[PDB]
Amino acid sequence: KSQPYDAYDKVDFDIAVGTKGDCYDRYLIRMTEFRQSLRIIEQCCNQMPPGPVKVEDFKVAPPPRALMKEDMEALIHHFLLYTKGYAVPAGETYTAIEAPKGEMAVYVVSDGSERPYRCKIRAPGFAHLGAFDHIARGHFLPDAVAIIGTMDLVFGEVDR
Amino acid sequence: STKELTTARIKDISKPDENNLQQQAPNRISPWSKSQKPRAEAQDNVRFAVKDLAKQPRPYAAIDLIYKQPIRYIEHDNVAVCDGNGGAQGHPKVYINLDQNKAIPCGYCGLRFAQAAFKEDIES
Amino acid sequence: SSSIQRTLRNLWKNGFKKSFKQLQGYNDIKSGRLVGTDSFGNKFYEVDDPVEIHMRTRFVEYTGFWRQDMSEVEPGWHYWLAYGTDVPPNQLKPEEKSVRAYPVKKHVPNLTYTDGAYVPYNTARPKCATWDPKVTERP
Amino acid sequence: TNPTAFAQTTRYVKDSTEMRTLVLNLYRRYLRHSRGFVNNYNLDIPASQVRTKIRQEFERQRFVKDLPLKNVLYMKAQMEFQELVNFWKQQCHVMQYFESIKGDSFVQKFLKGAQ
Amino acid sequence: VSTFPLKSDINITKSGKTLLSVGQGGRSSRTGFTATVFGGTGFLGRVVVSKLAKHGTNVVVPFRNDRARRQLKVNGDLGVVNFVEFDIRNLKSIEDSVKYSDIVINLIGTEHFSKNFSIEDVNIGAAERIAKAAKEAGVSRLIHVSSYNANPSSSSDFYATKGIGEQVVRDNFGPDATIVRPAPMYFRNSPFLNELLQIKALGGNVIFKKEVYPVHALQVGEAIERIAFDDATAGQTYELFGKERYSKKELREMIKHIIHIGQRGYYPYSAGFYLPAPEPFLYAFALIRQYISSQPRFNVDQLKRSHINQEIDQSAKTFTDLGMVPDELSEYLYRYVKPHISYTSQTQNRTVYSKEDIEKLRDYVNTP
Amino acid sequence: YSSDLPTDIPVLSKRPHTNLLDYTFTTFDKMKNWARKSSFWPMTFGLACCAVEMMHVSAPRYDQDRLGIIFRASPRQSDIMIVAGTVTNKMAPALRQVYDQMPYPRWVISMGSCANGGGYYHYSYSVVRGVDRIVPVDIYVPGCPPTSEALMYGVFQLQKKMMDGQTHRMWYRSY
Amino acid sequence: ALRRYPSGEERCIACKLCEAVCPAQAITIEAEERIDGSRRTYKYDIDMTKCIYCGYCQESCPVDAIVETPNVEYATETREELLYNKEKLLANGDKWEQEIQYALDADAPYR
Amino acid sequence: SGGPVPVFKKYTTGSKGIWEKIRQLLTLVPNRSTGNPLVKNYRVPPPGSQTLKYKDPVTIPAGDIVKNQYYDRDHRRNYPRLVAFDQTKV
Amino acid sequence: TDLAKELVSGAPKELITERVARIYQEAKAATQSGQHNTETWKIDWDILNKGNRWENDLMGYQSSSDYMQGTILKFDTREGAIRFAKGQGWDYYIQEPKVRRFVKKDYSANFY
């Protein structure tokens, strides 16, 4: 809702907001997000439009295989996309999406080449686990297991 | 004789034996590349000491199979068009000139094309 | 699907010998219409029973009685078993079949834990050749 | 959020005289915990050999003159001290740390390949 | 071990082959050598296989126990360590192990006889068959490991068969066979130290009176690495032993203080740390368990060997000929008896015994 | 001291059953091999995405418990170690200690490209290039991740190997 | 698996596209002129312990020479058996050719 | 609105005859589905046996053979330039 | 500049006492008319005289022990490359790029 992306501005859904800020509220929110996601999936099935699924630009998107074996220009673009890749204009970006774990963002630095110069991956689980000391202090040992579960921690995301 | 088993040749001077495990392929004795390691030398390793050589992967030599295909002769045209005989599941379509008095193979499939006017010259 | 009546129907259709073999490997008594056999000898069936669940309408009867191996299923029927297609390889059109210029042998399963296990090796010759020494006498 | 045990607040010391005292204070802390290092990691050497090793590592940076380099060296030494005292290192790492060991002539390197 | 074991990157074997080493001497490096380690799943075998395979030398390990060979493959990279299922009563299996090998190390030997093999069959028959098969395969180097008191005229079956084994190997393989006579070896899970660490050691007054010259097992494996890759060691006999002579009674009491069994005065006697028994009773018990117990126990021959001390053949060669200084047991005693300490567990303070501490403890043991 | 070793006695894996004691110890082995094959207890050692496919083996669709497979949280109660995920240098000492704490008999399964040879992170500064550098591996399961059926096939291969064990007949014939 | 033409000739022309795309660098290719002059490879290795089974090599192949079969039951006792050379990959192509044809006939239009 | 839906309108295998009447009596929520996909409806034509003839979709302004100059749609090379404002320009 | 930043970088001592880095600007390829790659200064390390590459016998893989064999740093100016090499205390040498002499070229010269 704060920064719509990829047709999320053309479907209707609601967000559940807690009041007490504890694990039970977060469980209820994740169950509402279950039903809201099912609500979105139904709309996507009905509203799926025709057309290409990738950008109509063969300098970035690979051409179709049938067109590759008949067209001279398609073969060249197919050859270069898989051997050298496509160059990205120099610059930097910070793109964030509403990941199921929270806010997942990538800080990608481009130098005008075909390889990213820097790719910082922002993990919501990495930030959630950093607050574990502030949140789990004073609770008992079985409460820590619940707090770990309520943060939805996947340690590949944390240790990317 | 271990000279036909370790040297690259255009043709095998004898008939390949399908049951012989020292051949490069079941249908070909000699290797078909100058940098291709002979199978007999490769199998003479410590890792084959207690291993049955019959069950090892021994695919047929493609060089002997491709030359069993008859030459395609084109009538009233000096250009041959080949795309793998499969279309979308073949290879990129290429055009082969047939002006020269010989069969010219495809750059991908290896199928050889020639004009019918040169059929007598090629076969002899 | 887990009812005792289904087991009794399959017990009657299969018979004692067929069901007892299923009671040794399959952990379940099942019956179905024969679809075909592969080169290794395995038999493949399809179940018309309405009480069978989605993913359990196709099954194999292995040749062995005490041990079963999934790799023994021929590549022709491996795709059919996994619900990849509705056309069994024995029902394939002549143009849909694969054309091999090389002869076909009996299906060979996975050869691990045996003496026939695949042994990797380098298929390329050494990149440098040493000098063959020769002696020439000085004048 | 409470910092872990033996955690110090990172600070950039702008006085060379003050930096010398901090190194000396940290040097004594290493010596006092030498027996603890032997007990926690179950070393095969007595605590006397540990203190000799600690002195040798400290003497390697005795003649460092640049103050900005001293702050980084002191900061990393504090991090190393915290790692050892809190038993965060595995026993294998400490064993290999003390498992550190006349060079070969020209011909000896030549006959074997050298570098 | 070091970083590169070979003294040169090009080595010519006794059979004429030229072997070139590649790499700096790590896991991915190679030495160009292929070696067969008979009995590589034993105590000394694992040390030998680890040293050979860690530098890239191809190792062929004949084996009879399937579970015991699994841990050997970790030593080397992919394709370095190879296994062949073998039996000394199967001639074809032995000939397959040495077909591609430039070096054959015979570590097969036993102190007991079982329902299937006698002492002669393993110490003499197995060694002869391996040596003769190695020569017919054109193996450049053969290394045979006998015992420390090898003597063909000895009254002990173990020492006599080891003595005959030395002669039968040299006759079959030829004068180019190197023979190693290692002393009792101390190491982690070492048979020489396992007997001393056993709380209920029956007949300690009769058994623990033997005097030996214990040698580090890591050095014995290191010495074999030196011998295999040095053709100047062919045809020689090496006696591997430590400088300091020890009696098992001194080691037994020194260990007792390290384990801190004596923290309770009553406990060592109550727990059975001393089991004085007459030798005729020990002979009867050893004779009975030779046909009742399914696991190798203290047998009759080992009872004889308790009265025989280790005598060093002066004519043979030592670590000095191989350019090594023998390790002292006092330095490595603590780290190999440390696992058996009763409590420790960093309660108050670990008592780490250094080289000087062990020597002082030896004086306390002999002090009445 | 004369020794006459027979020359053509087949090895244990080829040796047929001749006398009555051969069938006795083969019966002893099969009773144990059946018990260990049937009571296949892996240890809960999920490291990375390979563990997700390991969870789906316990899912109702495959139901590993139907084969007698129960995951145990302690190395003492488990005889199978499934390395499902990436093994890092920071993790390697912990993996070795947990492996050593498993009582014998014990087996190790290497699942996924990370555990087999490092996979996507083969050229990483902090990744072990294969769990076999630390522990002996009995079976390697390929895939990224291996499917739930791929892992089950690997377990079946290990159970086939376990049923061929001859521990007690080895004592009778080989020792 | 490495596939063949219906005449038996290898499909691959040693173009080295798959080796370049491979995110894990699991493919090693060495090539030269064949004895008859064809552009063919004499060394094609895939480290199955290094591959991430991602399909980039299949997508980049201009002649559909390198494909991935639906096979998953090939777990091996030793890690060496997971180092496929050209002989292993070509044998897999011959063994699984019929099943690959099933997948191609249904998925090629979408490519 | 996603209100309650009767069980027979959901693509799951259900009960028949007397066993359907018994299920309605005993189940607390009779309109819930058992979750077993219909064998006669779910994935009955497998993806490998679909009869649909796929065709690559192409838009007219950007995928036609005429009036389709590439630089008119070359958005990648018409990217915004990076401009920084210092205190002098402000 | 004068600060010995290698004391805190953590890199092994062999990078200073045993390895030589080359500061260079990439030369124009003889097979192509593009000059984009020649606009940046790069730093790479000289190969080890032994162990740079050797053949693995199992699969023919190119084994190596040089951990810097695949590292190529990119710089926008020559001065920046020198300043970084000096800062890390590396033993280096500069290969000055070859400059193409300018010669007038016109179509009239094809006849005159």
Ligand SMILES: NC(=O)C1=CN([C@@H]2O[C@H](COP(=O)(O)OP(=O)(O)OC[C@H]3O[C@@H](n4cnc5c(N)ncnc54)[C@H](OP(=O)(O)O)[C@@H]3O)[C@@H](O)[C@H]2O)C=CC1
């Ligand atoms: N303190 C010591 O240990 C000393 C060692 N030695 C000798 O050094 C050599 C190495 O032995 P060590 O490692 O120290 O301890 P072990 O006695 O446990 O080693 C014996 C080795 O030989 C094998 N072996 C014994 N009998 C047979 C047989 N019939 N068939 C096949 N293999 C057999 C064993 O294989 P497996 O394990 O599979 O049964 C094992 O690998 C031995 O010969 C020993 O006599 C002599 C003096 C001191």
Ligand SMILES: CCCCCCCCCCCC(=O)OC[C@H](COP(=O)(O)OCC[N+](C)(C)C)OC(=O)CCCCCCCCCCC
């Ligand atoms: C008393 C303690 C408590 C009870 C414990 C019982 C444990 C269960 C038994 C283990 C089962 C097992 O292992 O049977 C599995 C094995 C198969 O072995 P495989 O490796 O798959 O094939 C190898 C075998 N071939 C080569 C023959 C294929 O079946 C058999 O060979 C069964 C045949 C033996 C004869 C059976 C009838 C004889 C009477 C037996 C009853 C008295």
Ligand code: SF4
């Ligand atoms: S092999 Fe693939 S699926 Fe398995 S842990 Fe590694 S990246 Fe994840």
Ligand code: SF4
């Ligand atoms: S599927 Fe495997 S081999 Fe093919 S490109 Fe991807 S990682 Fe490389």
Ligand code: SF4
């Ligand atoms: S992409 Fe295809 S044709 Fe090109 S090298 Fe790879 S397998 Fe051969």
Ligand SMILES: [Zn+2]
């Ligand atoms: Zn063609």
